[PDB]
Every structure is written in C-alpha cells, then in structure tokens.
Design an enzyme around this catalytic site. Structure first.
Site, PDB file in Angstrom:
ATOM      1  N   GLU A   1      42.548  19.838  10.678  1.00 43.93           N
ATOM      2  CA  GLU A   1      42.906  18.934  11.770  1.00 43.93           C
ATOM      3  C   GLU A   1      44.004  19.499  12.680  1.00 43.93           C
ATOM      4  OE1 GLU A   1      40.383  15.426  11.603  1.00 43.93           O
ATOM      5  OE2 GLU A   1      41.983  16.068  12.979  1.00 43.93           O
TER       6      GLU A   1
ATOM      7  N   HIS B   1      40.034  20.290  15.461  1.00 47.20           N
ATOM      8  CA  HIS B   1      39.932  18.926  15.960  1.00 47.20           C
ATOM      9  C   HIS B   1      38.867  18.820  17.048  1.00 47.20           C
ATOM     10  CE1 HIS B   1      41.640  14.911  16.197  1.00 47.20           C
ATOM     11  NE2 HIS B   1      41.821  15.020  17.503  1.00 47.20           N
TER      12      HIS B   1
ATOM     13  N   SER C   1      39.519  10.976  17.922  1.00 45.12           N
ATOM     14  CA  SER C   1      40.909  11.199  18.364  1.00 45.12           C
ATOM     15  C   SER C   1      41.390   9.895  19.005  1.00 45.12           C
ATOM     16  CB  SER C   1      40.969  12.453  19.245  1.00 45.12           C
ATOM     17  OG  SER C   1      42.268  12.703  19.794  1.00 45.12           O
TER      18      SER C   1
HETATM   19  C1  H1R Z   1      50.601  20.391  29.381  1.00 42.13           C
HETATM   20  O1  H1R Z   1      51.502  20.332  28.303  1.00 42.13           O
HETATM   21  C2  H1R Z   1      50.914  19.988  27.073  1.00 42.13           C
HETATM   22  C3  H1R Z   1      49.527  19.864  26.956  1.00 42.13           C
HETATM   23  C4  H1R Z   1      48.987  19.516  25.717  1.00 42.13           C
HETATM   24  C5  H1R Z   1      49.807  19.271  24.592  1.00 42.13           C
HETATM   25  C6  H1R Z   1      51.200  19.392  24.711  1.00 42.13           C
HETATM   26  C7  H1R Z   1      51.747  19.743  25.937  1.00 42.13           C
HETATM   27  O2  H1R Z   1      53.155  19.855  26.046  1.00 42.13           O
HETATM   28  C8  H1R Z   1      53.733  19.701  24.759  1.00 42.13           C
HETATM   29  C9  H1R Z   1      48.928  18.923  23.399  1.00 42.13           C
HETATM   30  O3  H1R Z   1      49.310  18.868  22.276  1.00 42.13           O
HETATM   31  C10 H1R Z   1      47.519  18.735  23.882  1.00 42.13           C
HETATM   32  C11 H1R Z   1      46.613  19.657  22.992  1.00 42.13           C
HETATM   33  C12 H1R Z   1      45.161  19.094  22.848  1.00 42.13           C
HETATM   34  F1  H1R Z   1      45.259  17.725  22.437  1.00 42.13           F
HETATM   35  C13 H1R Z   1      44.487  19.163  24.134  1.00 42.13           C
HETATM   36  C14 H1R Z   1      42.967  19.331  24.165  1.00 42.13           C
HETATM   37  N1  H1R Z   1      42.375  19.055  22.874  1.00 42.13           N
HETATM   38  C15 H1R Z   1      41.162  19.229  22.936  1.00 42.13           C
HETATM   39  C16 H1R Z   1      40.373  18.005  22.381  1.00 42.13           C
HETATM   40  C17 H1R Z   1      39.994  17.943  21.035  1.00 42.13           C
HETATM   41  C18 H1R Z   1      39.302  16.832  20.537  1.00 42.13           C
HETATM   42  C19 H1R Z   1      38.988  15.782  21.389  1.00 42.13           C
HETATM   43  C20 H1R Z   1      39.376  15.849  22.737  1.00 42.13           C
HETATM   44  F2  H1R Z   1      39.081  14.819  23.586  1.00 42.13           F
HETATM   45  C21 H1R Z   1      40.057  16.940  23.243  1.00 42.13           C
HETATM   46  C22 H1R Z   1      42.993  19.845  21.830  1.00 42.13           C
HETATM   47  C23 H1R Z   1      44.511  19.758  21.717  1.00 42.13           C
HETATM   48  C24 H1R Z   1      47.502  19.301  25.292  1.00 42.13           C
END
Ligand code: H1R
Ligand SMILES: *[C@@H]1O[C@H](CO[C@@H]2O[C@@H](C)[C@@H](O)[C@@H](O)[C@@H]2O)[C@@H](O[C@@H]2O[C@H](CO)[C@@H](O)[C@H](O)[C@H]2NC(C)=O)[C@H](O)[C@H]1NC(C)=O
Ligand SMILES: *[C@@H]1O[C@H](CO[C@@H]2O[C@@H](C)[C@@H](O)[C@@H](O)[C@@H]2O)[C@@H](O[C@@H]2O[C@H](CO)[C@@H](O)[C@H](O)[C@H]2NC(C)=O)[C@H](O)[C@H]1NC(C)=O
Ligand code: H1R
EC number: 3.1.1.7
Lengths: 528, 528
Positions: free
Chosen positions: A325, A438, A200
């Site tokens: 993904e 992912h 990522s």
């Molecule tokens: C707090 O408001 C938000 C928080 C997030 C989003 C959008 C927000 O507001 C629009 C996202 O889109 C993020 C979603 C993720 F990115 C967060 C955690 N990961 C886990 C992961 C996977 C692989 C490697 C890693 F290091 C971590 C999954 C999706 C959080």
C-alpha cells in the site's frame, strides 16, 4: 433512432450510445447532468438539482473533469499520467454516467455505483481504468459513476458559515445517489439493490455514506478498496479546515466569512489550484489540503467514533488492500526515493522519512514508530529500511484503518469479506521495488485486461474475469461466492483471501501485530 | 597433624580440613573471620576489620548465615529448600571461605571469588550448590566465597545518616575482597589475578564493584550470571530508601534519624526480618525491600549512568542468562500460577500479572507492555499467555538489563563473552513449564553433577566439566576458549553461544527486539 439508446428520466429525455466490447454491445449514457453547474455564485455551495430540460440531452461522451491539480511528478510517464485528467478542466462538471446491457434488461438489475479516488483533490469518472463497459457486458449489471467536486471547490470549509459549509463534494455524491433512486429504473436498474464501491478517497467516501444517515437509505451494500473513512488523511477537524481555508485565501489575495468567500469566488479556478498544496501544515506524504470536515452535519461525529458506536446489522461489506500500500507515496516526498533507482535508503533517511510519512505526531510517537519498524539485528540494512518505510506509510494510512473498520463492523452486526490483492500487473510501469502499488487492482475489477488494445497476458484476462464475478456476486447477493470458498472476516478469526493468479487462499489477520500498534496503542499515547 | 591445613594469615593462625572429591582431595578453610561481628551498636554500620586473635581459629566448618527471611512457599519442597539457610542464623556472620588444591599450590594460582545471589535479602556461602570442592580439584584455582549482610542488616539506608548510611552489605563484600588482596597468597592464590563471579543479586553486586572505584582495584575480570547492576530491582533512590526504612521503623514499634536507628538496634533481628516484605510499595514479584542505594558514595550516580559514561578498555567480562529467566518468579504472586498445575492463565490473569511483574510504571507503560507481548492473532491462548508473562518478567528484570550492560561495555572498550544457558537439569524438581529457571545453571558451574551422591547423567557430568573449563579459562586468561569458537559479543554482531549438551552454537541478538522496547523506548515514555 435506436430506442435502446433513448431513455427519459425525471428531468427530460436522453440519447445514449452503444459501445462495442469484445463480448458484445453495451448501452452507455455518458454525461447526464444531475446538478446545476456549481459556478460563479454557486462556487462552494451545496449542489442544486438539475432543473428539467426540453428536447433530448445527448449523453454520448464524458463531460469535463472537475478543476483539480494535475500531477507533474514524472511528466509523460504512464504511471503518473494514467491518473491525470483526460477531458478539459471546468467547474461545470457535475455529470454522471450509466452503462447498461444491450438490450436494456427487462427484469430489474442490481446496480453498482462507482466513486473514484484521488485524495479528494483529483480524479474523474472519465479515466480509462474506470471504463464500465466490461463489467456491464460480462456480468449483466447496471453501472453508474459520477463526477464530484474536489480540492478547494469540493471541500474548502469555513465551518459554520453558509457560503463555504464544506463537504459539498460529498453532497455531489449524495445527489447522484438520489438520482439513482429516482431514475435507474428507466435503465432497467433495480433501485432496491444498489452497491457502492470505491477506492482510496472513493473508499473513504463510501464509508462516510455508511456513517451518514441521509446517505444510508440510498444503498444496501458497500465495497471499500484500499481506503476507509477513519484513515488519518480522509477527514480534518473544523479548526484545521478553517485555518487551511484562511491561509489559502491570504495566499491568493483575499482578506467576516461572507466577504472572504465572496472574494474567493472572483479568483480564476486555476489560481486556487496553484496554491492548494501550500496550506498543508507539515512536510508530508499521503496528506491532502481539502478533505471532508467533521462538523456535526454530514458526519455527526468522527468516523472512528461513529464506527465504534454503530449498529450494522443487515449490511454486507467487501473490503481489501493491495500488497504494498505505501510504496507509491514515497517517491512523492520521502528523502532518498525515486522510481528511477532502487531507493536503498540510509538509516538517517529512514528516520527523516518516518517524520514525513507520519506527519504531525509527537517526538515520542515518532520513536514508537521507529521502535516497531526497525529490525534491531539489521538496523541499517537499506533494503529492510526501504520496505519498512513503505510499511509505515501503508499501515498507518490504509491497512490499519481498513482493518479497524472491518473488525468493528463484523463485531457489530455486518457481514464482512476481506481480501489482499497480490498480483503485480504485467503491464505495470512503476519500478519493481514498489511491488503491487496503491490503485493497481482497479483495472482488474473493471476488466481492462479484456480490452484488445491492451497488452495483457491471457492469465490476467482469466483473473480479471474472476474478480468481476466476485464483485458482481457480492453486488447481487451480498456474498462474493457462488454455489474454494471465501470465508467471512470476523474479529476473532480475522480471515481474508489473497487475490492473484493462484486460486483463493485463506489467511488470518490483516497485519495484526502492526495494527495493534496503530489502532490500540498509538491513540493512547497521543492522549497523554 | 597436617602441615598443609595450618595457615597463618595477618590476623593469626587457621586450621583447615581436607575434603574428598571423586578426583582427589582439596584443602578447605571455612569460617575465617574477616570483620568484627556487626552486632549491637555496630548494626547498620560499615564493617570493621577483624582484630587479630591468639591461638588457632577453627576453620573446618561453615559459619552462621546472616539473618534473612526463610522461604515458606512450598515447605519441604526441594526446589525452594536448596536455597534456604543451612546453618543457624546470626548477626555474627561475617566469615569467608577458601578452597585450594591439595597439597596447597606452591606457585601463585588464579583466584575466583564467588558473591552469592538472593535478592540482597537472603543467601549464604554454605549452600550445597556453592560447594567449591569440584572447581578447585578440576581446574586448580583458588576459590574464595564470603558472607555479606542482607536485608535491612546490609541495605537499610537513611541517606545522609552516619547511623544507617546504606550499602554496608556491599562494604562487607569490599572488605572481603581486601582480605583476599592481603591474605590469599598464604593459600597459594595470586592476588594479581582475581576474577569476581556472581549470579542474580551476586552478579549485580559484581557489577556494582566494576562501577565503584575503591572496589575496582581489587579484582581484574568479572563474571555476571543472570544479573546486572542496572536492573530495575537492584538499586533504589535515596527518597524511597528513606521511605522504606521509615516504614520499617513504624511497623516494629519505633518513632530524627539518630533516634530512629537507636530503636531499630534494640529490636531482635528476627523482628526486622518479619516486616521486611511489607515496606514494598506495590504488589510485586522480583522486587526486594532493602537493596543498594544510589547516594553519591558507593555509587556516585545510577548504574545506568555510570555504564554509559565508562571507559572499559582492559576489562574482560563473561555475562549470560538462563533460557527462562522469568518463569520462577511467577509462582510468588502472579495470579493463576502454581508449580502444581499447568498455570494456563486467562487474558484477565495475564493483564493482572503484567501489573505485578512490571510494578510502578504508569498505565500507559503497562499498556505498551501488553501491546508488545500479546499475540494479536491469539490474544487469549493460555499457553501463549503463560509464556508471554514469563518473558515479560524475565526480559524486564534480567535479559534486557544484561543485554544493555553487554552492549555498552563492548562498545566502550571491554571484551565481552555472552551465553544463554539452555540445559534443563535432569534432577530439576520444578515443573516442566518453567523451562530452565533462574539460578539452575550454578550447579553446573560448580561441578555438582560430579558428586556421585546425586543422580546426574553421564552427559551432564561432561557438560559440567566443559562449563568449569570455560569459567576457569576465563579466570586465567580473560578468554573462555581452549587454545567451535566462542566469539566475543559486540554491539553490532551481538553474538553469543548456547550452552547445553550440544557443542557450542553461535547466535545473534539477546532478544534484540524485546530489548529495544525495555532499553530504548520505555525510558522515553516514562520521562514524558
Ligand atoms: C504536489 O505536491 C504533492 C503531490 C502529491 C502528494 C504530496 C505532495 O506534496 C506533499 C501525494 O502524496 C500524492 C501522491 C499520490 F496520491 C498521487 C497519485 N496517486 C495515484 C493514484 C493511486 C490510486 C488511486 C488514484 F486515484 C490515484 C498515487 C500517490 C500526490
Ligand atoms: C535515488 O534517487 C534519488 C532521487 O534523485 C533524483 O533522481 C535520480 C534518479 C537522479 O536523477 C538525481 O539526480 C535526482 O535528484 C536520490 O536522492 C537524491 O540525491 C541527490 C544527490 O545526488 C540529492 O541532491 C537529492 O536531494 C536526493 N533526493 C531525494 C528525494 O532525497 C538517491 O540518492 C538515489 N538513490 C540511490 C542512487 O541509491
Ligand atoms: C493453578 O493453581 C492456581 C493456584 O491455586 C492453588 O494451587 C492449586 C494447585 C490448588 O491447590 C488451589 O486450591 C490453590 O489455591 C490456581 O489459581 C487459584 O485459583 C483459586 C480457585 O480455585 C483461587 O481462589 C486463587 O486465588 C488462585 N490463586 C492464584 C495465585 O491466582 C489456578 O486456577 C490453577 N490453574 C489451573 C487449574 O489451570
Ligand atoms: C515473601 O514474599 C515474597 C517473597 C519472594 C518474592 C516476592 C514476594 O512478595 C512480594 C520473590 O520475588 C522472591 C522469589 C525468588 F526470587 C526467591 C527464590 N529464588 C530462588 C533463587 C534462584 C536463584 C538464585 C537464588 F539465590 C535464589 C527464586 C525466586 C521471593
């Protein structure tokens, strides 16, 4: 006093620790200081090298997690909690780790350097899924990982200014890579065989080091898992970086760049973090507030330009993606989505979701997306709509950026191997409809199924051992094979392999039809 | 003398001729005048009704073909010659033909009215392939066909002028439909059951009579084969109609609208024909110089607009396409193509061919065409590219215009039946790579396989008899089915049948994915 746990590096002496693995012992040096703590007046500035010390630093446990938002989407759920910090938050966080065979090897050993992901807003080297003890034990490599600043503290930029230049998180990474060149040999590492690998935002970081000459001299091979520096979320332009910085400042009470940064430096770290997500310009998923900025310094142009213009002869690269993904981002903002039901969305929700997953494109661009990803014989089938939105988000943000990078580097002199990871872990706690989400190949690369306390099947432990062998063979030789074969990826044949419990199967084209739309057509559309 | 072949119509008396078919005789009245000859000062003017005559008009042979370009592409080749005029050219050409059972029906018989195709630049009722004798004998209907003016004689327009108003060829068709209302009963036809049917420009003609209220009272149901009024070639705007008429004048020596049309009327007909193709604005295929103009009169708005706005309750329509609509047109100007080799074009030829087959779209729009019709796993395979370019030309000009017409008519109260014609005639002289080309279903619709003089198989004669039964069923009842089933086409299920030697097979979607591009997305692109 075990002398396999005593090392001296240029700064001073270190005491480590020997860890047990199923297969034998491993020397671990956890929490080595490589930078002066970036606190107070050093908040937002490039890292300064760790000044030398007297006596012995105990490098015997992971140090603090850099300040970061903590996910609370589904509090207490394993799926979200496994990525949240497992050490106290602090701005004093610039520490790296070394795992090495016990006993320390005598011949210089190839070195793997891990860079965690987390959208540049989150992550830490101390997470359990990044435990380097199994790779080191199973494959006799040296493994290094570093913490780097994230969120506002690592990537807030008032570009041009001296007090918030931006990209300091990448400079944390670069400083760790210089530490590896001057000090890994003391651990039996070989500073002339160094392979970066990340996932990522880590994979995007790896890519920006390829495209940044000061970093390019510090390593020799690259692994990019589920990320690339040309992705639409991995960089931001100077103007939008300054807008987000300025809006963050207004939000926390601050008013001249010097005065403004000085005011931010007096805010409790937690206060900045609490307003992080509010500077995003559109309602979105897979979009993060403070990411690397293209300012002519770290990146002399955008990653798309630098990739297209680059000479990559002499570089070997291993890249890949998981099977689904995009699914995991949808439960974070797309209307109609939950981990707790089947998320069978309506056509009205699908259209609303495309605007969220493809934020800040034109109404025309949004139509072109709906055209390509609707099935016009079944335009309202909720299963087809849920998997199409999943593919919009995954193709736009990961699969098509990765495919563009692979094709360009092959065409321009690099040896490239490519994979699609297709095994859904038996212990996965996310719903079945998300497929292989992912980030869930990482545990298999690091050998976590070999942990006794982990309740994996015996086949998954065999599979974990296959993957560590591919990764260590690549790090040692630039080719994941050893004397079914894994063919190089090329822009013509576009060959990759599937990684799951079945033996290697070759396929052609990383979602080639979809990716023609995102990498060829859609740019032209936005240009007119 | 035979009292069955003497007929008195409003204008005077006619003497017909008895015709042999394998199944029995048939009465034919050929060359009935229905307008004053549109000559001298009447050139470019709407048709006047034929003034009555004394004595007996000889109606035993076909009459003159209206002046038109003659195809010289493959001189003496059967594939091009079957469409060329087979009677002298004359501006004195406004005649129509009636075929009726022998002896003449004494009770009212449903009427089929054939409007021939030919790009609005060519065509004639006397072609062998439009021989009414077999339908009439097999299905006991009355069949009428008429000649209408083509090329500049029928469709040269100076919009707003009284000397060249445009669309007079369409008025020729309307006048003949009126002649049928007032006279068809004298032959045993029922003027309350008149089905129009046409192919290519004839189908677009039929569709224009649907959308034009003065015509709409002169028939009751419609058949549209391989054509539609909303196709990009079938109409032209006032501006471009005037540009084309003005450039024709310059090219033949001519200089105020009145003064311009006066000089064009002093020119021999052949002179106008000779410069016809040179007023086209781009290098093209499937584009004709003088076609119906949207001027507010015969078409109060564009056919696309009149379709989207229409209440079509009470209308039954039979619409359909051949399997390879586009292939035929490629040998008239797509680079790399000929009937005499495999036409295995290169990528560079394909890209050139796309600008020729989609002429006068922006570069961005051409790019989108190349996106959607390239196999990005095989972007250079010549057989794939030959097929793709064929599909580009077929979908852009016929299949997707027809699919749009069907879906809106169905969703706005019409009962629609749709077919794909998938039989390649054993007697077909064009190469095998052309498949089932544009126009090569007509000979089965008219039952030509039943002519023993020709080399059609036994199964083809049976196929021909099925088709004539479907068509004549639709003529009698607005339903092709005999009382496997032929389901109606709806905007939802999009069901259609394949017509070939096998029994009917129901399928879904007339190239639903390709038509979302041409019909939904591409308009939006061109307006931004
Ligand atoms: C707090 O408001 C938000 C928080 C997030 C989003 C959008 C927000 O507001 C629009 C996202 O889109 C993020 C979603 C993720 F990115 C967060 C955690 N990961 C886990 C992961 C996977 C692989 C490697 C890693 F290091 C971590 C999954 C999706 C959080
Ligand atoms: C799937 O769930 C989503 C999310 O709803 C949340 O989670 C559910 C398990 C349940 O606990 C809900 O009460 C939660 O709000 C559903 O989408 C929500 O629908 C509600 C109406 O009940 C609406 O108020 C919310 O705005 C919706 N949330 C989002 C993010 O769109 C969705 O309807 C469920 N799908 C099903 C049941 O098929
Ligand atoms: C298929 O034929 C086309 C057309 O060429 C014509 O027909 C051939 C049968 C032969 O008689 C040619 O001499 C004719 O000119 C070929 O395309 C042409 O190639 C020539 C070069 O030899 C070139 O000068 C013309 O401009 C081309 N014409 C067009 C319309 O593009 C084509 O190469 C042939 N395909 C093959 C052999 O695979
Ligand atoms: C003279 O310069 C041209 C001539 C033509 C084109 C383009 C030109 O350069 C701009 C065309 O596109 C036309 C090609 C055809 F349209 C004409 C012949 N028909 C046969 C047919 C089929 C079904 C019904 C019919 F009535 C006639 C098929 C292709 C001619």
């Amino acid at each position: 006093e075990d002398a396999e746990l005593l090392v001296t590096v240029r700064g001073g002496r270190l005491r480590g620790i020997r860890l047990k693995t199923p297969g034998g012992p491993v020397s671990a040096f956890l929490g080595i200081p490589f930078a002066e703590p970036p606190m107070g007046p050093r908040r937002f500035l490039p890292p300064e090298p760790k000044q030398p010390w007297s006596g012995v630093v105990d490098a015997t446990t992971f140090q603090s997690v850099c300040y970061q938002y903590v996910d609370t989407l589904y509090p207490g759920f394993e799926g979200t909690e496994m990525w949240n910090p497992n050490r106290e938050l602090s701005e004093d966080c610039l520490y790296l780790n070394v795992w090495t065979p016990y006993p320390r090897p005598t011949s210089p050993t190839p070195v793997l350097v891990w860079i965690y992901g987390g959208g540049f807003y989150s992550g830490a080297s101390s997470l359990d899924v990044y435990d380097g003890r199994f790779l080191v034990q199973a494959e006799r490599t040296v493994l290094v990982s570093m913490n780097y600043r994230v969120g506002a503290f690592g990537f807030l930029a008032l570009p041009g200014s001296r007090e918030a230049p931006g990209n300091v998180g990448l400079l944390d990474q670069r400083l760790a890579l210089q530490w590896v060149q001057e000090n890994v040999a003391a651990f039996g590492g070989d500073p002339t065989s160094v392979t970066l690998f990340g996932e990522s935002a880590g994979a995007a970081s790896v890519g920006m080091h390829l495209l940044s000459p000061p970093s390019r001299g510090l390593f020799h091979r690259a692994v990019l898992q589920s990320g690339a520096p040309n992705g639409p979320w991995a960089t931001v332009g100077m103007g939008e970086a300054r807008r987000r910085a300025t809006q963050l400042a207004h939000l926390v009470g601050c008013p001249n760049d010097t005065e403004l940064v000085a005011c931010l430096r007096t805010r409790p770290a937690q206060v900045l973090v609490n307003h992080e997500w509010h500077v995003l310009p559109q309602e979105s998923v897979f979009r993060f507030s403070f990411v690397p900025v293209v300012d002519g310094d770290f990146l002399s142009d955008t990653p798309e330009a630098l990739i297209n213009a680059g000479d990559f002869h002499g570089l070997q690269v291993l890249v890949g993606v998981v099977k689904d993904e995009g699914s995991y981002f949808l439960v974070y903002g797309a209307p109609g989505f939950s981990k707790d039901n089947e998320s069978l969305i309506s056509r009205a929700e699908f259209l609303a979701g495309v605007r969220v997953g493809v934020p800040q494109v034109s109404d025309l661009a949004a139509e072109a997306v709906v055209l390509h990803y609707t099935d016009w014989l079944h335009p309202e089938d909720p299963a087809r709509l849920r998997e199409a939105l999943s593919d919009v988000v995954g193709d736009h943000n990961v699969v098509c950026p990765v495919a563009q990078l692979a094709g360009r580097l092959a065409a321009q002199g690099a040896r490239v191997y490519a994979y699609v990871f297709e095994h859904r872990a038996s212990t996965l706690s996310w719903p079945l409809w998300m497929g292989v989400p992912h980030g869930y190949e990482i545990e298999f690369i690091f050998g976590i199924p070999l942990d006794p306390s982990r309740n994996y099947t015996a086949e998954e432990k065999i599979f974990a051992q296959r993957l560590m062998r591919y990764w260590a063979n690549f790090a040692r030789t630039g080719d994941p094979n050893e004397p079914p074969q894994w063919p190089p990826y090329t822009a013509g044949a576009q060959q990759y392999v599937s990684l799951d419990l079945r033996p290697l199967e070759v396929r052609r084209g990383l979602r080639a039809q979809a990716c023609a739309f995102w990498n060829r057509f859609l740019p032209k559309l936005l240009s007119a």
